[PDB]
Structure 1
Amino acid sequence: ALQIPFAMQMAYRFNGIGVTQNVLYENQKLIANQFNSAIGKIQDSLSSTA
């Protein structure tokens, strides 16, 4: 296991789907908020529906 800052790991994950890194870094807060809200929606979906 080789440590690596999570923002840079996500930069690699972006650069692996054909989107340059600067897209993430310039939109890091937007992407972080989108991810957090998505996880919240997952909680709601699992809690409401069996």
Structure 2
Amino acid sequence: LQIPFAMQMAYRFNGIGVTQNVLYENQKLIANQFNSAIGKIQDSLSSTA
């Protein structure tokens, strides 16, 4: 069933016991922290075996 990705992440915030408005009011910070954290996986795997 399709759902917009920010609304799926708001359901996942409810699943950890954080209210949905915490995601919608911080959405750009949460997206940046995710994009940054994937960049660290990329760098660590690029760095060492």
Do they fold alike, i.e. is TM over 0.5? yes
CA distance in 2, matches of 1:18, 1:45: 31
CA distance in 2, matches of 1:5, 1:49: 36
Q: TM-score under structure 1 normalisation?
A: 0.96
Aligned residues: 49
Give the Å deviation of 1:49: 1.0
Give the Å deviation of 1:25: 0.3
Give the Å deviation of 1:15: 0.4
Give the Å deviation of 1:7: 0.3
Give the Å deviation of 1:33: 0.2
CA distance in 2, matches of 1:7, 1:26: 11
- Percent identity of the aligned residues? 100
CA distance in 2, matches of 1:43, 1:3: 29
Runs of 4+ in 1 over 2 A off after TM superposition: none
Q: Write out per-residue CA displacement over residues 3-49 of structure 1, whole angstroms, 9 at most, x where no aligned residue.
A: 00000000000000000000000000000000000000000000101
